[PDB]
Amino acid sequence: CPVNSYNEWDALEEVIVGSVEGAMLPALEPINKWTFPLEELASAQKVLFETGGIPYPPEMIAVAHKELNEFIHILEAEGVKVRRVKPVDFFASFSTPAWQVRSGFCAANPRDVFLVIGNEIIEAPMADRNRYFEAWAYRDLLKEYFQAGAKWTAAPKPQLFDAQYDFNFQFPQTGEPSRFVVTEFEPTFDAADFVRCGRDIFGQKSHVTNSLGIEWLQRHLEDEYRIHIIESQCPEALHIDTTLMPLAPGKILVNPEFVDVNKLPKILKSWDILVAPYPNHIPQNQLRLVSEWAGLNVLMLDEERVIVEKKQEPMIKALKDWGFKPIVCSFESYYPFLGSFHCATLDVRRRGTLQSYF
Amino acid sequence: CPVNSYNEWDALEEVIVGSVEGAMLPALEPINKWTFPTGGIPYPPEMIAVAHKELNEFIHILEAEGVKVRRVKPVDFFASFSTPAWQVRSGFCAANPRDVFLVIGNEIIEAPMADRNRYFEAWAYRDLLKEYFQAGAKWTAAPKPQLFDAQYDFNFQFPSRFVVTEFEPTFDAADFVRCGRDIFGQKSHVTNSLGIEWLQRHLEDEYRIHIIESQCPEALHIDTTLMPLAPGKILVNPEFVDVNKLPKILKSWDILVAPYPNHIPQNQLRLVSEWAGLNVLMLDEERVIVEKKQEPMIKALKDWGFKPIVCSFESYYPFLGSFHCATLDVRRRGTLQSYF
Numbered sequence: 001c002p003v004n005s006y007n008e009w010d011a012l013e014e015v016i017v018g019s020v021e022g023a024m025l026p027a028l029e030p031i032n033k034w035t036f037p038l039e040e041l042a043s044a045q046k047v048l049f050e051t052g053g054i055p056y057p058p059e060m061i062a063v064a065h066k067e068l069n070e071f072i073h074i075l076e077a078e079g080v081k082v083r084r085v086k087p088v089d090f091f092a093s094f095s096t097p098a099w100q101v102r103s104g105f106c107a108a109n110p111r112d113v114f115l116v117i118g119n120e121i122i123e124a125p126m127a128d129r130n131r132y133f134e135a136w137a138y139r140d141l142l143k144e145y146f147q148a149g150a151k152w153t154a155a156p157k158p159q160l161f162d163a164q165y166d167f168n169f170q171f172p173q174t175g176e177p178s179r180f181v182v183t184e185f186e187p188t189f190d191a192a193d194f195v196r197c198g199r200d201i202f203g204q205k206s207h208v209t210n211s212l213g214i215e216w217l218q219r220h221l222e223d224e225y226r227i228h229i230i231e232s233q234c235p236e237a238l239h240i241d242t243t244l245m246p247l248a249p250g251k252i253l254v255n256p257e258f259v260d261v262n263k264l265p266k267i268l269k270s271w272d273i274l275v276a277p278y279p280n281h282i283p284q285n286q287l288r289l290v291s292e293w294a295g296l297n298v299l300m301l302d303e304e305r306v307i308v309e310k311k312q313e314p315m316i317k318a319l320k321d322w323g324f325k326p327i328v329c330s331f332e333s334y335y336p337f338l339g340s341f342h343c344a345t346l347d348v349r350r351r352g353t354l355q356s357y358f
Numbered sequence: 359c360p361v362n363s364y365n366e367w368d369a370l371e372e373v374i375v376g377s378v379e380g381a382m383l384p385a386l387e388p389i390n391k392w393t394f395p396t397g398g399i400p401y402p403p404e405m406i407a408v409a410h411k412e413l414n415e416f417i418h419i420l421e422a423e424g425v426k427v428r429r430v431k432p433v434d435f436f437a438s439f440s441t442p443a444w445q446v447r448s449g450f451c452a453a454n455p456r457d458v459f460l461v462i463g464n465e466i467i468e469a470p471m472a473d474r475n476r477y478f479e480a481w482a483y484r485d486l487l488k489e490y491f492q493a494g495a496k497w498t499a500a501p502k503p504q505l506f507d508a509q510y511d512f513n514f515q516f517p518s519r520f521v522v523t524e525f526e527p528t529f530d531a532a533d534f535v536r537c538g539r540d541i542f543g544q545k546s547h548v549t550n551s552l553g554i555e556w557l558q559r560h561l562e563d564e565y566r567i568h569i570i571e572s573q574c575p576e577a578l579h580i581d582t583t584l585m586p587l588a589p590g591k592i593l594v595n596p597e598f599v600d601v602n603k604l605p606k607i608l609k610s611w612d613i614l615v616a617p618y619p620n621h622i623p624q625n626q627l628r629l630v631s632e633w634a635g636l637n638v639l640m641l642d643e644e645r646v647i648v649e650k651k652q653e654p655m656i657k658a659l660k661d662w663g664f665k666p667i668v669c670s671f672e673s674y675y676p677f678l679g680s681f682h683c684a685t686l687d688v689r690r691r692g693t694l695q696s697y698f
Contacts, residue, residue, distance in 0.1 A: 092442035097434050097449065097478055104442065123501055133442055136504060143526065143552075151559060154499040156468055159481060186488060212488075219496060 003150035003348050005116040007196050008246045009300040010352035014081040016110045016141060017072055018344045020056070020064045020337055021087035023106030026289070027052040027130045030165040034181050034207050035236045038171070040288070047287050052130045053102030055091065056336070060286070064108075064333040071307070071329050071341065078301055078327070083348075085110065088137045098161055101130050107137040108337035110346035112239065114138070115191040117221060118354060120151035125158045125216070127188035127208040132160070145348065155216055158186050171235045178231060180207045189213030192239040192343060194227075197246050199356040200267060201227045204244075206237040224354065228265040234258040241342045242293040247274070247324065248303040249357050255293055267358045274322055277314035283332045290335050297340035301327075307341045361495035361688050363461045365536050367588045368692030369642040372426040374455050374486060375417055376684040378409045378677055381451030382435045384629070385475050388510045392521050392547055393578040394629050397475050398447030400436065401676070405627070408673040409453075416647070416669050416681065423641055423667070428688075430455075430482040439478060443506055450475050452482040453677035455686035457579065459483070460531040462561060463694060465496035470503045470556075472528035472548040477505070490688065500556055503528050516575045520547045529553030532579035532683060534567070537586050538695045540607065541567045544584075546577045564694065568605040574598040574631075581682045582633040587614070587664065588643040589697045595633055607698045614662055617654035627676045637680035641667070647681045 002014065026032045028048040036044045048054075072082050090104040105128070113134050115122040121142060123135050135142075146152045158164065163185040172179050182188060189209040194217070195202050201221070203214055218227045232243055234257070245253040253274045254261060261273055276296055283290045295312035304323075308315055310330045319326045331340055360372065378401070384390045385397045417427050435449040450473070458479050460467040466487060468480050480487075491497045503509065508525040522528060529549040534557070535542050541561070543554055558567045572583060574597070585593040593614045594601060601613055619632050635652035644663075648656055650670045659666050671680055 089442050093440070094442055095438070095440045095445075097437035097439055097481065135501075136442065139501075139504060139526070142501070146527075146556070146559075152501055152556070153560070154501045156480070156484075156487070156497060156499045157502055159484060186484070187491075216491070216497070219491075220498070 001119050001149040003116065003119050003121060003145050004352070005347050005350045006118055006352055006354050007198050007350070009248045009303050010350035011302045012080050012300070012347055012350050014083065014349035015075065016083045016085060016138065016346040016348060017068070017075070018108040018110050018339070019085045019087050019137070020061045020068065020106060020108050020334070022090045023056040023061055023108060023337060024052055024090045024103040025049070025054045025056055026105060026338065027101065030167070031128050031181060031207055034169065035238050035289070037236065043288065051101045052104070053093070057286070060333070060336060064337060067331050067333045068344070071331060071344070074307065074327060074329055078305065080301065083141055085137050085141070094133060096160070098159065099129060103130065104133055105130050106337060107134065108334070109192070109339040109343045110138070111192045111241065111339070111343045112190045114346055115194065116346060116348055117196070117225070119149070120153060121145065121348070122191070122220070123154040124191045125155035125188050125213060126190055127158070127160065127164065127182050129160050155187060158188050161185065164188065178205070178233070178235070180205060180237065182208060182210045184210055184212055187212040187216040189217060190239060192241055195240055195244060195246055197357055198354055199225055200358060201225055202230055202240070202244055202265070203227055204230050204232050204237060204240050206232070206239065208238055228267060230259070230265065231263060232258050233260065239343070242291060242296045245296050245298065245342070247298070247300055247306065251322070253296060255296055257293070270358050274318070277318045279312060279314055281311055283311070283335055285332070285336045287336045289338060294335055294340050297342045299341035299345055309340060359464045359494040361461065361464050361466060361490050363687050363690040364463055364538050364692055364694050365690070366586045367640045367643050368690035370425050370640070370687055370690055372428065372689040373420065374428045374430065374483065374686040374688060375413070375420070376453040376455050376679070377430050377432070377482070378406050378413060378451060378453050379432050380435045381406055381453060381677060382448040384450060384678065385446070388512055389473055389521055389547055392514060392516070393576045395576070395631055396446045397449070398438070405676055409677060412671050412673045413684070416671060416684070419647065419667060419669055423645065425641065428486055431485050433482045441505070443504065444474060446475050448475065449478055451677060452479065453674070454532070454679040454683045455483065456532045456581065456679070456683045457530045459686055460534060461686060461688055462536070462565070464494070465498060466490065466688070467531070467560070468499040469531045470500035470528050470553065471530055472503065472505065472509060472522050474505050498560070500527065518571065518573070520545060520577065522548055522550045524550055524552055527552035527556040529557060530579060532581055535580055535584060535586055538697050539565055540696070540698055541565055542570055542580070542584055542605070543567055544570050544572045544577065544580045546572070546579065548578060568607060570599065570605060571603060572598055573600060576631070579683070582631065582636045585636050585638065587640055587646065591662070593636060595636055598633070610698055614658070617658045619652060619654055621651055623651070623672045623675050625672065625676055629678060630675045634675055634680050637682045639681040639685055649680060
């Protein structure tokens with residue numbers, strides 16, 4: 001079976017890599033405006049439109065395609081087979097009986113759309129209406145893997161009625177408990193709100209993943225897996241792979257601003273908590289949807305070799321001091337497409353078996 | 359758990375029933391024209407009204423027999439919708455729950471349906487599905503198909519051969535009938551080999567799916583062809599099935615060959631075949647709902663030792679189903695067993 005991946009670190013044999021061609025800007029409503037701190041909202045709301053329909057600037061796609069090519073060259077030189085997803089018509093509008101949008105998004109972030117659990121690929125029930133058909137660019141690959149023995153399932157496709165979103169939402173106060181824009185109307189989650197450690201999987205609630213979605217995944221995986229939910233302190237939370245990143249058995253990288261290490265699930269007590277260094281560096285781009293914590297979005301080729309971004313000099317040094325072997329790559333041109341190395345990949349085959357590590 | 363159904367015959371406790379409200383006529387192209395003896399046109403209100411009346415008496419019969427009957431949500435079938443690759447003028451209706459979902463034990467599976475107009479047909483059921491999930495049910499979807507032009511043979515002509523191609527997995531749930539650890543299915547104008555193979559893999563830990571060969575050139579759904587009525591008793595359509603070519607495993611069962619109806623349903627709009635009389639619903643191993651004009655079937659079931667419960671339902675036929683099509687048995691009292 002060509003699909004076999006149980007965690008983030010077993011020796012990487014085959015990976016799907018995203019594509020920035022034909023990419024359309026994120027839509028501001030009703031989710032993504034809440035990924036901006038209030039002081040960034042003014043600039044972002046000029047750039048991003050209500051329901052999509054605006055392409056990424058061609059020059060941004062071109063520069064990102066160049067760094068993507070170098071990233072792929074590194075992967076191949078390190079012995080990984082790379083499957084390049086082909087663009088499709090993200091510019092096209094689509095509609096359901098209840099709502100319509102002006103375009104899709106893009107295929108830059110395979111990690112958001114699918115979970116790989118052992119020999120199974122699961123299509124996520126995504127809360128973002130503009131991403132309703134994002135699996136389409138991958139269906140050639142999925143049908144190939146299914147023909148060769150992979151399991152392939154979907155969460156029920158959500159309706160995404162207005163009831164799924166809190167239109168009175170406001171960020172909590174500094175004291176108050178966390179809260180996000182999605183409601184409990186129906187199950188939704190993005191796959192990248194989860195990271196995989198064999199029989200134990202860690203997730204978070206976010207602006208796209210609600211309790212019903214987590215409950216759905218726990219029931220789907222209940223025979224063999226346990227899902228543990230962390231609390232993020234990031235008010236803009238959307239995806240966990242700049243917050244909590246397993247690197248190897250017994251080693252987990254944690255964001256010091258988004259995680260209170262003293263409130264982490266107790267199962268993590270047997271592991272070494274590697275607290276990420278501060279980057280002292282804000283990436284810049286003509287659209288600015290960056291978080292400074294993009295440096296945590298690393299990709300493990302095995303328990304030792306880790307791809308990390310060239311300007312993340314503190315992360316590179318910490319990884320070396322922690323015993324890893326960083327392989328550096330320029331990749332900040334990918335950040336406006338809302339991912340770095342981990343977001344940009346789906347690790348469909350890592351050599352290994354299902355174990356418990358805690 | 360409230361969802362618990364392993365076959366077509368264990369004592370029936372809870373059922374979802376279809377609705378004809380807001381129904382849009384079926385679209386001819388590219389599937390349905392090959393199944394008769396892009397939408398946007400409603401069913402005549404008079405046709406809906408008469409069907410609604412007979413539907414209410416069917417529901418009354420079920421409730422009088424101790425069954426809990428759940429009704430769906432009224433939704434906008436008139437609305438158009440579109441994907442990046444295609445658009446349609448409307449949906450269809452919620453008259454046929456049996457087509458849209460498969461109930462396998464405690465799991466409800468949403469079918470990957472080949473008919474573009476039925477892409478959102480699960481929407482009328484989602485309040486119930488979320489209730490059952492909240493109460494412990496498993497709830498899964500086959501990957502939602504793209505339904506590109508490549509999925510259909512537009513130059514199709516009757517010869518077995520069907521309109522759906524092998525571009526991607528598609529099936530309608532009603533192309534399968536359930537016998538505990540063994541399930542019977544068929545290829546049809548909407549269910550292809552990739553679709554069957556998907557379901558076989560999804561259910562491989564506990565179930566075996568046996569494929570029969572339909573002789574019906576218009577084949578669409580198996581529940582007028584092959585109908586398990588009780589352990590060791592299966593009703594077979596003599597025109598659609600060669601009894602000598604049935605799966606070897608059926609050797610140990612009694613094959614009950616359906617009588618000929620000598621009756622063509624009379625309606626202004628006639629889209630189902632004369633074999634609609636096989637589309638019966640079992641309330642247990644003995645009580646069976648059967649349509650009032652199907653006098654040969656009523657007599658045959660009686661002689662075979664069943665207890666027919668008669669109901670007028672021909673006004674539902676223009677909506678492309680009868681009793682089995684119009685229901686989804688979510689709970690029958692029983693466990694998973696082998697019957698072969």
